[PDB]
Amino acid sequence: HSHGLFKKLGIPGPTPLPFLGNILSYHKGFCMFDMECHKKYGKVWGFYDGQQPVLAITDPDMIKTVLVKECYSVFTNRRPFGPVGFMKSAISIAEDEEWKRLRSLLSPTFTSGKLKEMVPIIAQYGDVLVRNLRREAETGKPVTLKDVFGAYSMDVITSTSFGVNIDSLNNPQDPFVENTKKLLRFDFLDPFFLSITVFPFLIPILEVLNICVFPREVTNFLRKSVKRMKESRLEDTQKHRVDFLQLMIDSQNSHKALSDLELVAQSIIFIFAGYETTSSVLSFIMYELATHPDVQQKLQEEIDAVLPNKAPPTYDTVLQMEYLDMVVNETLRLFPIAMRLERVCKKDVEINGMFIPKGVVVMIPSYALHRDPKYWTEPEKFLPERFSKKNKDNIDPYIYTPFGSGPRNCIGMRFALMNMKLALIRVLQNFSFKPCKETQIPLKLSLGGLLQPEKPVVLKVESRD
Ligand code: HEM
Secondary structure: OOOOHHHHOOOOOOOOEOOOEOHHHHHHHHHHHHHHHHHHHOOEEEEEEOOEEEEEEOOHHHHHHHHHHOOOOOOOEOOOOOOOHHHHHOOOOOOHHHHHHHHHHHHHHHOHHHHHHOHHHHHHHHHHHHHHHHHHHHHOOOEEHHHHHHHHHHHHHHHHOOOOOOOOOOOOOOHHHHHHHOOOOOOOOOHHHHHHHHOHHHHHHHHHOOOOOOOHHHHHHHHHHHHHHHOOOOOOOOOOOOOHHHHHHHOOOOOOOOOOOHHHHHHHHHHHHHHHHHHHHHHHHHHHHHOOHHHHHHHHHHHHHHOOOOOOOOHHHHOOOHHHHHHHHHHHHHOOOOOOEEEEOOOOEEEOOEEEOOOOEEEEOHHHHOOOOOOOOOOOOOOHHHHOOOOHHHOOOOOOOOOOOHHHOOOOHHHHHHHHHHHHHHHHHHEEEEOOOOOOOOOOEOOOOOOOEOOOOEEEEEEOO
């Protein structure tokens, strides 16, 4: 019962109930709870996830000392979350020294160089998306974005980690599409995870019963999948391509190296971390564009000016589109799908005047901060202008953090950005998007612990001649 803590330190917050902490307050989701506390406790506050104390911070400098300055020594890990199994060694779950080794070994995977080399691969599935989406534009019945984009997203993950070239959308069956599909990001407000937070003592029990938040079904398949390919597939050499797996294998053959269990776990996590995030953001971007016909027109003019007569998109060409970048960034402001960044304080400290005791989870409420009236004129509005070179000097890099910051930010950032824009450039060269009847306006965020549409986005899709 650390419920005494925040008053003992003099830190404001809502009143915990015995056992539950402040969880009952999650009935309206992480984001709405965060915005409420901000409005009423000011710069910093505390609360309890069961008996787990969590201190929220909104100070640009404070946030930076945590994410940047003192990542290495004090604020290195995220909070443990459930029985994790062999995935305990995935880079985004790993901790302290184990984590640093992996971050180092996997860094070259996401180089500028290696990114450029993957353009021809992912571009090839831009084509396929178009081909596909076209079919629906003829059908004239409203499109489901999460489905069209999920396909695209899966298509791109598979190929860029050993080239498993599959049209997911039309191959509803293939063993490989089915397993991966089931790799859905976790809802830390579902019945299961709510119980884990209140009875965290129940975790070691589950670990001993070989139960795991990553279903046995999918991970088994994948290890046994990666199995055949990793050796006895490319054990014949020739036509070596660029993909995360080879990239990781190449460091397997001459604090170095990756084990045959650690490599399987990164492979899985990349999917987990990339699959639904990419597809979701892309839905939010298409939503914004359809409910803002103007911005879409502006965007299609830029694309056409840079890439005349449907010319195929490229690396250098993509880094050159400033309005595209603006639209992507605005969308992320409004829908920063991680919602919060979190670090566990490993030892007593004081940071710009405020003392953090060992064991507290320090939490930065991204969704809140992105909508804070202090930094944003018209917070709730979709306005890409906000991110023009003529203004970007006015956005604070520790208020706007859709991919986090410091040494433990999204290692897949440049790749996510490039991949998404590629999808957009090709989709927008060919079609336009339009609100439907079944389109929700204004859209409504879920009650869950995911940032996602309450009801999946469906839009009218019109071809360009
Ligand atoms: C647009 C979709 C995506 C968004 C919004 C996104 C956002 C983030 C955020 C906010 C974090 C936490 C950073 C922190 O703790 O401060 C993160 C971590 C991470 N992301 Fe991304 N991400 C996206 C796609 C990706 C992709 C495509 C990959 C790689 C394939 C990726 C791999 C990771 C990994 C491995 C971590 C943990 C890094 C570490 O602990 O060293 N995510 N992501």
